[PDB]
Amino acid sequence: MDFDMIEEKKDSVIVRNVENFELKDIFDCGQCFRWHRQENGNYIGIAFEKVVEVQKIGEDVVIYNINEEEFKNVWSEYFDLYRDYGEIKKELSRDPLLKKSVDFGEGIRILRQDPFEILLSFIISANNRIPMIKKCINNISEKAGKKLEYKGKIYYAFPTVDKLHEFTEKDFEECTAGFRAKYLKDTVDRIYNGELNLEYIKSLNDNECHEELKKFMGVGPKVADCIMLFSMQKYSAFPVDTWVKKAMMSLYVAPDVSLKKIRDFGREKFGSLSGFAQQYLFYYA
Numbered sequence: 001m002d003f004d005m006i007e008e009k010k011d012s013v014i015v016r017n018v019e020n021f022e023l024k025d026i027f028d029c030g031q032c033f034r035w036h037r038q039e040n041g042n043y044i045g046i047a048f049e050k051v052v053e054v055q056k057i058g059e060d061v062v063i064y065n066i067n068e069e070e071f072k073n074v075w076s077e078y079f080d081l082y083r084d085y086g087e088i089k090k091e092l093s094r095d096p097l098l099k100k101s102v103d104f105g106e107g108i109r110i111l112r113q114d115p116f117e118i119l120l121s122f123i124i125s126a127n128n129r130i131p132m133i134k135k136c137i138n139n140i141s142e143k144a145g146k147k148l149e150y151k152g153k154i155y156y157a158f159p160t161v162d163k164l165h166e167f168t169e170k171d172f173e174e175c176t177a178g179f180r181a182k183y184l185k186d187t188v189d190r191i192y193n194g195e196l197n198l199e200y201i202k203s204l205n206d207n208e209c210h211e212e213l214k215k216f217m218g219v220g221p222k223v224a225d226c227i228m229l230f231s232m233q234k235y236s237a238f239p240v241d242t243w244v245k246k247a248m249m250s251l252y253v254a255p256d257v258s259l260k261k262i263r264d265f266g267r268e269k270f271g272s273l274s275g276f277a278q279q280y281l282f283y284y285a
Contacts, residue, residue, distance in 0.1 A: 020085035022107020183218025
């Protein structure tokens with residue numbers, strides 16, 4: 001475990017003496033969309049139908065708005081606190097640039113996010129900008145998500161598939177999904193109707209999991225890798241887009257090939273820890 005113990009306070013939990021845990025590294029490495037740094041330095045986010053605020057003080061991490069039970073059942077897992085990242089970084093250090101990368105983004109951790117929210121969020125992310133992704137997620141949540149209140153302000157949890165199933169393609173378009181509206185509608189309907197089972201897909205091995213995920217409309221290799229890495233703990237994932245291809249041709253002398261071949265190249269290159277390798281590497285780049 002990458003922490004020593006926790007102490008429950010009035011309206012928060014303090015995780016004492018955490019290791020390999022830095023807020024900016026975790027929340028700003030591109031793996032999540034509903035978190036953002038506040039003027040005071042704390043991060044605030046919405047996950048598992050809850051508004052949470054996180055602050056690091058010295059060697060400790062304060063998680064506001066949760067108690068000990070919630071930390072044990074939800075948040076300790078969310079932050080992947082039982083995984084030894086010192087060991088992950090040691091293994092990746094067998095590559096000179098990764099070593100340089102893990103030293104820079106030493107506090108990176110891969111969050112264990114909700115499969116459903118991640119599925120929709122990354123379909124929305126395809127060839128999109130972060131501000132637009134957040135906007136779409138926010139619009140969808142405000143329209144059908146559970147209303148939450150924190151410190152006097154209103155927030156909206158991500159909607160259940162039950163609520164989203166009532167959305168028409170046009171509704172998604174109006175929430176600003178653009179050409180992705182059709183992908184979202186189709187995908188929400190398959191989840192609702194049980195045509196594809198996320199829990200079942202998550203129980204498959206990395207490669208088989210990846211293939212099932214690609215059956216979703218709006219989900220290609222890239223999006224499938226993000227989904228299984230960030231919500232299914234399939235660590236051999238290696239999300240590849242145009243930028244990644246350029247980075248790999250430049251840094252690892254990868255040939256000018258298809259993104260599919262760049263993915264194979266990278267996974268062969270970094271092995272079973274490809275998911276971690278690329279998060280560190282591209283955070284440093």
